[PDB]
Enzyme design. Sequence first.
Site, PDB file in Angstrom:
ATOM      1  N   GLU A   1       0.851  -1.221   0.000  1.00  0.00           N
ATOM      2  CA  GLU A   1       0.000   0.000   0.000  1.00  0.00           C
ATOM      3  C   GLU A   1       0.858   1.231   0.000  1.00  0.00           C
ATOM      4  O   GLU A   1       0.637   2.123  -0.831  1.00  0.00           O
ATOM      5  CB  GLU A   1      -0.972   0.020   1.177  1.00  0.00           C
ATOM      6  CG  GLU A   1      -2.125  -0.990   1.077  1.00  0.00           C
ATOM      7  CD  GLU A   1      -3.154  -0.773  -0.088  1.00  0.00           C
ATOM      8  OE1 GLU A   1      -3.042   0.245  -0.786  1.00  0.00           O
ATOM      9  OE2 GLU A   1      -4.062  -1.627  -0.302  1.00  0.00           O
TER      10      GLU A   1
ATOM     11  N   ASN B   1      -7.463   8.576  -6.175  1.00  0.00           N
ATOM     12  CA  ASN B   1      -8.220   7.581  -6.922  1.00  0.00           C
ATOM     13  C   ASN B   1      -8.997   8.277  -8.038  1.00  0.00           C
ATOM     14  O   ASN B   1      -9.235   9.515  -8.010  1.00  0.00           O
ATOM     15  CB  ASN B   1      -9.203   6.901  -5.992  1.00  0.00           C
ATOM     16  CG  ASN B   1      -8.513   6.256  -4.790  1.00  0.00           C
ATOM     17  OD1 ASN B   1      -7.623   5.443  -4.964  1.00  0.00           O
ATOM     18  ND2 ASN B   1      -8.943   6.602  -3.595  1.00  0.00           N
TER      19      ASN B   1
ATOM     20  N   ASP C   1     -12.148   8.369  -8.714  1.00  0.00           N
ATOM     21  CA  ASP C   1     -13.392   9.010  -8.325  1.00  0.00           C
ATOM     22  C   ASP C   1     -13.148  10.341  -7.612  1.00  0.00           C
ATOM     23  O   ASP C   1     -14.119  10.932  -7.149  1.00  0.00           O
ATOM     24  CB  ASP C   1     -14.242   8.071  -7.470  1.00  0.00           C
ATOM     25  CG  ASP C   1     -13.611   7.800  -6.081  1.00  0.00           C
ATOM     26  OD1 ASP C   1     -12.450   8.232  -5.874  1.00  0.00           O
ATOM     27  OD2 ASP C   1     -14.295   7.235  -5.201  1.00  0.00           O
TER      28      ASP C   1
ATOM     29  N   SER D   1     -11.538  10.597  -4.799  1.00  0.00           N
ATOM     30  CA  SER D   1     -11.219  10.305  -3.421  1.00  0.00           C
ATOM     31  C   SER D   1      -9.668  10.132  -3.356  1.00  0.00           C
ATOM     32  O   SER D   1      -9.010  10.014  -4.389  1.00  0.00           O
ATOM     33  CB  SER D   1     -11.973   9.089  -2.874  1.00  0.00           C
ATOM     34  OG  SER D   1     -11.565   7.909  -3.530  1.00  0.00           O
TER      35      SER D   1
ATOM     36  N   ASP E   1      -6.402   8.078  -0.981  1.00  0.00           N
ATOM     37  CA  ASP E   1      -5.923   7.124   0.013  1.00  0.00           C
ATOM     38  C   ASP E   1      -4.750   7.723   0.794  1.00  0.00           C
ATOM     39  O   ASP E   1      -3.852   8.357   0.186  1.00  0.00           O
ATOM     40  CB  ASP E   1      -5.424   5.893  -0.671  1.00  0.00           C
ATOM     41  CG  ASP E   1      -6.523   5.116  -1.403  1.00  0.00           C
ATOM     42  OD1 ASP E   1      -7.740   5.320  -1.218  1.00  0.00           O
ATOM     43  OD2 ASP E   1      -6.121   4.227  -2.137  1.00  0.00           O
TER      44      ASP E   1
ATOM     45  N   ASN F   1      -9.150   5.258   2.620  1.00  0.00           N
ATOM     46  CA  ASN F   1      -9.741   6.087   1.608  1.00  0.00           C
ATOM     47  C   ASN F   1     -10.735   7.095   2.192  1.00  0.00           C
ATOM     48  O   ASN F   1     -11.481   6.778   3.123  1.00  0.00           O
ATOM     49  CB  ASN F   1     -10.402   5.182   0.600  1.00  0.00           C
ATOM     50  CG  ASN F   1     -10.883   5.934  -0.584  1.00  0.00           C
ATOM     51  OD1 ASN F   1     -10.148   6.263  -1.502  1.00  0.00           O
ATOM     52  ND2 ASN F   1     -12.113   6.189  -0.577  1.00  0.00           N
TER      53      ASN F   1
END
Length: 129
Positions: free
Chosen positions: A35, A46, A48, A50, A52, A59
Site C-alpha cells: 500500500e 483515486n 473518483d 477520493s 488514500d 480512503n
Amino acid sequence: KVFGRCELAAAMKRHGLDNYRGYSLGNWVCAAKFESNFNTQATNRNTDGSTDYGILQINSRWWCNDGRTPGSRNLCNIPCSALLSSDITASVNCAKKIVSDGNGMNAWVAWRNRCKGTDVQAWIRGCRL
Ligand SMILES: [Cl-]
Ligand SMILES: [Cl-]
Ligand code: NA
Ligand SMILES: [Ru+3]
Ligand SMILES: [Ru+3]
C-alpha cells in the site's frame, strides 16, 4: 516516517492488529508494504476524486474527512491528515473498523492481489516480537 519492516510489525502488534478479525500480523505488514512501502506520508488519488492516506492507504470516500471528496463519509471520525502521522494509532484504529465491515482484508486491493494466499508470515521473519 518510513518504518522498518520489523519496526512496523512491532508497532502494529503493540496496537492490537496481530490476529485482529483473524488476520495474523504478517497480513498487516504485507498490506502496508504494498500500500505505502511502509511510508506514513504516502497519498494516492483515486479515479473518483477520493484519496488514500497513510501506511494502509485508507480512503476518504468512507473513512476520513479531507474536505474534498463530495458525498463521502468519515466513518473513523478523523481528518485524513491524522492518517499520515509518524504515530500509527489513528491508522490502526481506523483499519480495525474497516476490516470489521464484512469483507475483512479484501477492503485492501493490494492485500487481495499481492498478499492473500501467500506466505505472509515471511513479512515478520527475523523480527523480535
Ligand atoms: Cl469531503
Ligand atoms: Cl475475514
Ligand atoms: Na470523507
Ligand atoms: Ru459498510
Ligand atoms: Ru514460511
